[PDB]
Amino acid sequence: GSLAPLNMKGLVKFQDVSFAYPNHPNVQVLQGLTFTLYPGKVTALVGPNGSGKSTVAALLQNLYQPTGGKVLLDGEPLVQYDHHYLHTQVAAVGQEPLLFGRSFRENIAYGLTRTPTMEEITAVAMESGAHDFISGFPQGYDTEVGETGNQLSGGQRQAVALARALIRKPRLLILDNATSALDAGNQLRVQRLLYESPEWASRTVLLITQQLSLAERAHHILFLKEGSVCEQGTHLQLMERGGCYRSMVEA
């Protein structure tokens, strides 16, 4: 399909979604999967290894389509949205991002549908915690970054990739173990970005992590087990119930 609307809220709904990878049809990854990601909220997606969290992230980028049920963005099936329109409103960051371009400046601007100013580049780098280390180099943002950012440190890489996601001003930001290498100061910066920024209380965030301390301030938590939401709610609500989430935090 062909949708590319001017205005977007960012309301995401999975409705009884099922999925198996195309070249492994008999292996159910997601099943009976239902949840809502509300606009301007941080929703955490947590659960055991192999439960399907990264697969959910992939469907949210329309990398694959559900085998059953519906994946909706503002009440419209995702598959109907323009490939490029989606690219502009949906941004995913993983644990080990590939950083294209020859310098920090090019790394951050890469993939953006326009030419940003250095002011804009600097702003998002300050938000992501990348600015300080970048500014420490003689050439600053024009310092050469080699072979897709593999000469940066683990956390420097994540900080740069996050800046690059932020400058797109996406309606849906997906963080998949994306801050696991950040130091405490930068992790704090990202907590402030997620929960104390005026821009991200209007945009919607899917936060996938094994570090449940990061998810405590989430507005909603989804606990995924064997491809479906076992339980969901706030940290305190889930802690009161005494189920999967409780057992994971206490462990």
Ligand X SMILES: Nc1ncnc2c1ncn2[C@@H]1O[C@H](COP(=O)(O)OP(=O)(O)OP(=O)(O)O)[C@@H](O)[C@H]1O
Q: Is 51 in the site for ligand X (CB under 6 A)?
A: yes
* Partner interacting with residue 129 (select from ligand X, Mg ion, a copy of itself, none; CB below 5-8 Å by kind): a copy of itself
Q: Are 200 and 165 in contact (CB under 8 A)?
A: no
Window 181 to 210, contacts with ligand X (CB under 6 A): 181, 183
The answer to whether 50 is annotated as binding is yes
Residue of 37, 32, 41 whose CA lies nearest to 72: 37
Give the residues across from 14 on adjacent strands.
Answer: 35, 71
Token digits for 112?
């953006």
Q: If you ran DSSP here, which 8-state letter would residue 103 be given?
A: B
> Contact letters (x/-) for Mg ion, 151-180, by CB under 5 A?
--xx--------------------------
Binds ligand X by CB under 6 A, chosen from 15, 34, 54, 88: 54
Token digits for 237?
């609500």
Q: 99-132 burial, b for 16+ CB within 10 Å, e for fewer?
A: bebebbbbbbbeeeeeebeeeebbbbbebbbbbe
* Partner interacting with residue 65 (select from a copy of itself, ligand X, Mg ion, none; CB below 5-8 Å by kind): none
For the bound state, the minimum distance from the C-beta of residue 166 to ligand X, rounded and expressed in Å, comes to 18
Token digits for 8?
């977007």
Which parts of this chain interact with a copy of itself (CB under 8 A)?
21, 24, 26-27, 47-50, 53-54, 95, 129, 133, 137-138, 151, 153-156, 159, 176-177, 180-188, 210-213, 248-249, 251
Which parts of this chain interact with ligand X (CB under 6 A)?
21, 24, 29, 49-55, 133, 151-156, 181, 183
